């Protein structure tokens, strides 16, 4: 249980990071509608936001359903795997943010 909550909380921290990133893309893009690659960046980030929302709701489903109860090793290995994937994602996002800061300033 503690691990499910901790991972989901990590997911939501990551989602807030993405929302800041997309507010920043919003400013930048709004300055230059001229660039359709900024259009892409915005679209891709929004896709990511929708997918993370869907995954957060899927694990909300799973988490409350599991709360409704008192084989587990596969879920634990999936937890390890999702944590590693999340780590990769945050690394990517931090690199993206650094490039974006280079590009805005």
């Amino acid at each position: 249980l503690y691990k499910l909550k901790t991972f989901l909380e990590n997911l939501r921290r990551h989602l807030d990071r993405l929302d800041k990133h997309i507010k920043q893309l919003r400013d930048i893009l709004s300055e230059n509608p001229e660039d359709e690659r900024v259009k892409d960046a915005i679209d891709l980030s929004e896709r990511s936001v929708r997918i993370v929302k869907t995954v957060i709701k899927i694990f909300e489903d799973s988490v409350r359903k599991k709360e409704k109860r008192p084989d587990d090793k596969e879920l634990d290995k999936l937890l390890d795997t999702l944590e590693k994937i999340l780590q990769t994602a945050t690394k990517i996002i931090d690199d993206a943010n650094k490039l974006l800061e280079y590009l805005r300033r």
Binding site: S48, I51, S62, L78, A89, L103
Partner: protein, 33 residues
């Protein structure tokens, strides 16, 4: 900015989309599990 930087940035975004799609396939198929 130099579009080499911008293309690398977009590539990062795409890597991120792919990793999150992996997350989602895992989440869905584990929910089924």
């Amino acid at each position: 900015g130099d579009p080499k930087v911008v293309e690398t940035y977009v590539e990062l975004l795409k890597r991120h989309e792919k990793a999150v799609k992996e997350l989602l396939e895992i989440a869905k198929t584990h929910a089924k599990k």
